[PDB]
Amino acid sequence: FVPESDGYFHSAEHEGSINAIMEEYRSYFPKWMCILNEGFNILLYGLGSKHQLLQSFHREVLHKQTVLVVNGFFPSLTIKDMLDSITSDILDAGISPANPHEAVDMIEEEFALIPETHLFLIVHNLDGAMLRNVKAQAILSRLARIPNIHLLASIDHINTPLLWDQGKLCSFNFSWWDCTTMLPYTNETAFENSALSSMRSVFSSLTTNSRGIYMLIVKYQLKNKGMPFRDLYSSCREAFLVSSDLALRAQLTEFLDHKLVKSKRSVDGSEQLTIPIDGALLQQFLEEQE
Amino acid sequence: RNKYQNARRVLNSAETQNLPGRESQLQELREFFSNHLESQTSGSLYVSGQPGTGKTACLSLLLRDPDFSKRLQRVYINCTSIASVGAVYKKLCTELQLKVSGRTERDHLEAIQRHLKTAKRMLLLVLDEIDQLCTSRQEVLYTIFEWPALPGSRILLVGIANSLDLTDRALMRLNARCELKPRLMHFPPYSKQQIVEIFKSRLAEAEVLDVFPPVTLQLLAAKVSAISGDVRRALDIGRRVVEIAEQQKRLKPVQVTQVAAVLNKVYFPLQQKLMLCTLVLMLRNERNKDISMGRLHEVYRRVCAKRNILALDQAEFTGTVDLVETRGILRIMRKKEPRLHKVLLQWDEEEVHAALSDKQLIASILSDTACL
Amino acid sequence: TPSQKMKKIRAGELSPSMQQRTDLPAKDSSKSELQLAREQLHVSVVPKSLPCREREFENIYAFLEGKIQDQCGGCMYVSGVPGTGKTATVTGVIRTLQRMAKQNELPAFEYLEINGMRLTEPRQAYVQIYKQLTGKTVSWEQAHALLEKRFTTPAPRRVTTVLLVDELDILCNRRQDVVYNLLDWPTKSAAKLVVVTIANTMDLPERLLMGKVTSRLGLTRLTFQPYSHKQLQEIVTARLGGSETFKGEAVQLVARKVAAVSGDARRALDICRRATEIADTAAVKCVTMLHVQQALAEMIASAKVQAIRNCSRMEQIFLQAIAAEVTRTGVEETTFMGVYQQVETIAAFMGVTFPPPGRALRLCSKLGAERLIISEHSRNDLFQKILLNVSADDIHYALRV
Amino acid sequence: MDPTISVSKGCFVYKNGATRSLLGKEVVQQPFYEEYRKAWNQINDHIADLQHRSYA
DNA sequence: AGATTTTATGTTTAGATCTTTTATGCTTGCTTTT
DNA sequence: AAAAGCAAGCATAAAAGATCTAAACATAAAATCT
Numbered sequence A: 001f002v003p004e005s006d007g008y009f010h011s012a013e014h015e016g017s018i019n020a021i022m023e024e025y026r027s028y029f030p031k032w033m034c035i036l037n038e039g040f041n042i043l044l045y046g047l048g049s050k051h052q053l054l055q056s057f058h059r060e061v062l063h064k065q066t067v068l069v070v071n072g073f074f075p076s077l078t079i080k081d082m083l084d085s086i087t088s089d090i091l092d093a094g095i096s097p098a099n100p101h102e103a104v105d106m107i108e109e110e111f112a113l114i115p116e117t118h119l120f121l122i123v124h125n126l127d128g129a130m131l132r133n134v135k136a137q138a139i140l141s142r143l144a145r146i147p148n149i150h151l152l153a154s155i156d157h158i159n160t161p162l163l164w165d166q167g168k169l170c171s172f173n174f175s176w177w178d179c180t181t182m183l184p185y186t187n188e189t190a191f192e193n194s195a196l197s198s199m200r201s202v203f204s205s206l207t208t209n210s211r212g213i214y215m216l217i218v219k220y221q222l223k224n225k226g227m228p229f230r231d232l233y234s235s236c237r238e239a240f241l242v243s244s245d246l247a248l249r250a251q252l253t254e255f256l257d258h259k260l261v262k263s264k265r266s267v268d269g270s271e272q273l274t275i276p277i278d279g280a281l282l283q284q285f286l287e288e289q290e
Numbered sequence B: 001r002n003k004y005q006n007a008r009r010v011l012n013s014a015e016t017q018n019l020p021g022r023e024s025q026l027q028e029l030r031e032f033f034s035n036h037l038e039s040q041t042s043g044s045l046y047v048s049g050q051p052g053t054g055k056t057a058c059l060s061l062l063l064r065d066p067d068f069s070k071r072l073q074r075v076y077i078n079c080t081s082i083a084s085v086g087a088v089y090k091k092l093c094t095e096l097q098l099k100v101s102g103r104t105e106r107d108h109l110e111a112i113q114r115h116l117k118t119a120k121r122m123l124l125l126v127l128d129e130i131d132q133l134c135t136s137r138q139e140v141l142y143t144i145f146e147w148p149a150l151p152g153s154r155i156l157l158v159g160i161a162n163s164l165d166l167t168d169r170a171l172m173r174l175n176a177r178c179e180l181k182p183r184l185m186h187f188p189p190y191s192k193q194q195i196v197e198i199f200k201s202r203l204a205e206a207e208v209l210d211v212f213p214p215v216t217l218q219l220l221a222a223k224v225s226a227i228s229g230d231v232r233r234a235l236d237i238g239r240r241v242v243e244i245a246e247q248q249k250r251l252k253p254v255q256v257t258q259v260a261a262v263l264n265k266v267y268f269p270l271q272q273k274l275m276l277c278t279l280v281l282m283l284r285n286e287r288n289k290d291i292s293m294g295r296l297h298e299v300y301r302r303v304c305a306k307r308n309i310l311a312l313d314q315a316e317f318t319g320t321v322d323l324v325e326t327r328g329i330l331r332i333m334r335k336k337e338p339r340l341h342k343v344l345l346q347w348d349e350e351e352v353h354a355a356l357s358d359k360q361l362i363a364s365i366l367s368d369t370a371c372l
Numbered sequence C: 001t002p003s004q005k006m007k008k009i010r011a012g013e014l015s016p017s018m019q020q021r022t023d024l025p026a027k028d029s030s031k032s033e034l035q036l037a038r039e040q041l042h043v044s045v046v047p048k049s050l051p052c053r054e055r056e057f058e059n060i061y062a063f064l065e066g067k068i069q070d071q072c073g074g075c076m077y078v079s080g081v082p083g084t085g086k087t088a089t090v091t092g093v094i095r096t097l098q099r100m101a102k103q104n105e106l107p108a109f110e111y112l113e114i115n116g117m118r119l120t121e122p123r124q125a126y127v128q129i130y131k132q133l134t135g136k137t138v139s140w141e142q143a144h145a146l147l148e149k150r151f152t153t154p155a156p157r158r159v160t161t162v163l164l165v166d167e168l169d170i171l172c173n174r175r176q177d178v179v180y181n182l183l184d185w186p187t188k189s190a191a192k193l194v195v196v197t198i199a200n201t202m203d204l205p206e207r208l209l210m211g212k213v214t215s216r217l218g219l220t221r222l223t224f225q226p227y228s229h230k231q232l233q234e235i236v237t238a239r240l241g242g243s244e245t246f247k248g249e250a251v252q253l254v255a256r257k258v259a260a261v262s263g264d265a266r267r268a269l270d271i272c273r274r275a276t277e278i279a280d281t282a283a284v285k286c287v288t289m290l291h292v293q294q295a296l297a298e299m300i301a302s303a304k305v306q307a308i309r310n311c312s313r314m315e316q317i318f319l320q321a322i323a324a325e326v327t328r329t330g331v332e333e334t335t336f337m338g339v340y341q342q343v344e345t346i347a348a349f350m351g352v353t354f355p356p357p358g359r360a361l362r363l364c365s366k367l368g369a370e371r372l373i374i375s376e377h378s379r380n381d382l383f384q385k386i387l388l389n390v391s392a393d394d395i396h397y398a399l400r401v
Numbered sequence D: 001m002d003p004t005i006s007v008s009k010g011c012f013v014y015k016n017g018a019t020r021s022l023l024g025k026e027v028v029q030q031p032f033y034e035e036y037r038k039a040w041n042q043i044n045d046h047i048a049d050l051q052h053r054s055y056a
Numbered sequence E: 001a002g003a004t005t006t007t008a009t010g011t012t013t014a015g016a017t018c019t020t021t022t023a024t025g026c027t028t029g030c031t032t033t034t
Numbered sequence F: 001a002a003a004a005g006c007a008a009g010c011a012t013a014a015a016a017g018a019t020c021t022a023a024a025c026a027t028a029a030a031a032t033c034t
């Protein structure tokens, strides 16, 4: 792979083949055990999902050693959660100190106190959604520096080694391994990190006066191809759809909560009330209400 | 004593046994509990709807059934009552009398999971007002809704909330796995005839049906179901009609005049008058509605000078504008200094003119362009 | 040991006494008539029956008597601008109900009360309501659990309990758990709670309460309108009794100039006390109208022209040059550099030299500590921004006339 | 799905008696592991001796 | 009848939140040299 | 005529600024060991 800069300056059979590929990567495992015994850490950099491969390594080989699986594709994990997990469950040392590097110093002391109590550490997606900051990678490199702790990890993003400087890449004593499974990224993309019908479904739950207020904004939008707030207020007080200003502000706050209406303030202080839907579907919606 | 106090007592707005308006919802909830009992499988559920529509009344009715008392272990937790979002597991342990090694929420969660893995009876965990459990990471709500998908767990949990889309917007991650996402049940707001049937149930439980003629009940429900549709405001105006008629008359059925008067009811100091007139003048004459307290006071002093009456100082003018703010006529956006606070009118001038009730003065202030 | 004292305090077994005077208070008969008016005019002396609040008394009385006799429970929200007789009317209704329940004309009832500004935290109300029941001081979690055990569980013979709640807007916060519990407890049939909530803003349930909390608060409501020109006169002439120590035109001027500002009754009862103290030092025994005019000019004070006239001459040149730069540049916020250039122009006109800018920053700091101007911290000299806090015409009125 | 794939937790302990040489005896008693450990200890100690004698 | 963790509680500080306000940047819409 | 270049415009977002809250830290009540 030797990219050209001119692109920047000008800017079935598959199941059996995948099973043979997975059986070869399953055959690699004793070599990984010897490589982890010599102090190197394992890094996988294939195309497809490597979740099942590292789960098979935890299941078939590390069935009795201490293991902390870490799901790096989790949107909401924190490095405090992982250090708290090690400090509380592996060592029974209680909660880790609030400074993460103090927690790594504590983990290094307590793991210096116990030889031949190895802690395997499997991190699916070391380039995770909350591990992409430099600080969490510094914590993971300081943890992988420990002789007791061994590390297996997955890599998926193309720009991952931009956050590993030579100090982290020396603490991460990686043995790179091309584990290119062709499996789809189901679990890695299942999480949160990666409409006229909904408008009808929320319009059905509204009361009659809320239907009248939204129909007034719909009629003004189709008539003008966002309405100022004062016209909606005078139209509602003429049609008796509201008691005072504050109930109308509560109804528009409910519409902002259910995203039927976008409120764009003007420089003059008037509030504009756009409906964020194209006018053909809005005309069909007005025809649906008749 | 008399029929007036009898109807005022029976409109009540407390817990009830009969629920005439919610019948298909009760049958659907009973069918959900019954099919998930007969299949012996777990099943999450999310009931939602506008306040006052009767969700807690239906689930309080269904947590007192003798047959469900025989078949499943009911638990009701009001989620406002907990000290914190993470403390709810501890409260659940007190609802199940589980033994816990104690004094950390993690061991309470492990005790609840150890009970769920080997429970002898099906568990019905109703979490009323589940919107209080939402935080940011939302570890607690996802941990609770992951319990039906746990291997061998027999919990079936119901979450009551006011939001139509709290499940999707607050729990997008449950959509990825169809075994995890709750079945949804809306509770639609009450119609006019449903509020009339609730009134005709409550007034016939005490046989005080005659104090309300049907015409004025069909006026009251036509107003309330059009405005909001909650039965709490409907029973409140129905109680208020009788407690105003008792004060007013001291059997007379209530007329439409009394209910129309209470429905039209429900649904100044001179310096405050001068402040409102100068604010209306500055809002009319100027395209820029960014009015500060100092920019308003400098015009108010000139208006008081031309009216030949003494003006308040800025330290008293700030308290005067704060007293006008309590009526809802204004809203003051606070800033670093009292002079820099931004007045914002919240009534239209056609309401402010009818509220001041001194048209000869407002005609003088609004024709006084030269003092700006 | 201190721990026995704290345990006897938290158990309520020692009453918190305050030290008594060494000397006896003076006898009532030695007082002058003007002193008798000065002590009848104190705001702490609530009348046994409030003038000009009869309609609100009938409203709160009919609500509370119906909620007590029906044994059902419920809630009410009274509101109005401060000093308008809210809490005095509610406690007067509750004292009348207690006098009636003492004579067995009414069922007996408990009367809890709290106030939202006497609590450091919204949850501390759970500590206080329980303290009006058992008298023990406990943590708010145990107090909330014991209050739920008291109210959710039907325990005959339960007595009706009226929970007055002043200062409802302080108890709100973001979660609104405390106000939700206080308004949700009456809805349960087992609790006979009748909660009354006093507040200032009329629009509070719609402005800052949640939709379910507003739905629980209900539609029964009462608004205390500000006292008018006449009701403030009736209040003060009821406080004075039959005494003629106040002229009627003096009370009329106090009421006319207090009702035009706020409608507060405390302002009238304080201005009349100050007028009595002013008449006392003149050795007159009747509060004539010029004593009321002096007390009104003192207690509706406007002493900024006196501050500009009392400033040192370089500070007056500074106050002229800030308004000169505001007139010149148009915008109301001026940097210190152009203010100093206008200072040098005005000082060259008047003939006095001006202090160098390190002393002009001391002048700006003095005016900003006196709040004649708004100004930043002095560490960023020549580029600090100088708002004028006094109006521009007040400076010319001070330094010309 | 898999028990490791949870919607709530992000880390999953599999503790086996941790309190407060990975290979079995077949590999360590093999002669090639003995000669590899011998050559590696000799080479690493000589390089550390060179680094100390350069820093001294 | 006295010392020791043990636990429940209150305080304080760091972090989440609401809100305004200000800005670079992402895109657009012409605009203009080669 | 082709593709680089200047005002325009909404928008994520960035500061910020108050503000509220959750967890870490100091501390007191108390079973526990002697």
Ligand SMILES: Nc1ncnc2c1ncn2[C@@H]1O[C@H](COP(=O)(O)OP(=O)(O)OP(=O)(O)O)[C@@H](O)[C@H]1O
Residues within 6 Å of the ligand: B013, B014, B015, B016, B018, B019, B020, B021, B022, B049, B050, B051, B052, B053, B054, B055, B056, B057, B058, B162, B198, B231, B232, C212, C213, C215
């Ligand atoms: N269908 C009905 N028939 C008769 N009475 C009803 C019905 N629904 C509700 N009510 C009355 O309304 C009162 C309030 O209902 P409920 O508390 O169940 O509403 P909610 O949805 O729980 O309100 P929130 O969402 O604010 O908690 C109940 O005490 C009950 O007496």
Ligand SMILES: Nc1ncnc2c1ncn2[C@@H]1O[C@H](COP(=O)(O)OP(=O)(O)OP(=O)(O)O)[C@@H](O)[C@H]1O
Residues within 6 Å of the ligand: C042, C043, C044, C045, C046, C047, C050, C051, C052, C053, C080, C081, C082, C083, C084, C085, C086, C087, C088, C089, C199, C200, C235, C265, C266
């Ligand atoms: N109608 C009245 N007649 C006689 N005295 C009155 C009247 N109204 C108010 N006062 C006097 O003014 C004081 C007002 O106190 P009160 O507790 O009523 O004020 P409040 O409206 O509760 O104020 P806030 O709303 O700030 O709490 C009372 O002590 C009373 O002596």
Ligand SMILES: [Mg+2]
Residues within 6 Å of the ligand: B055, B056, B057, B128
């Ligand atoms: Mg409810």
Ligand SMILES: [Mg+2]
Residues within 6 Å of the ligand: C086, C087, C166, C198
């Ligand atoms: Mg009060």
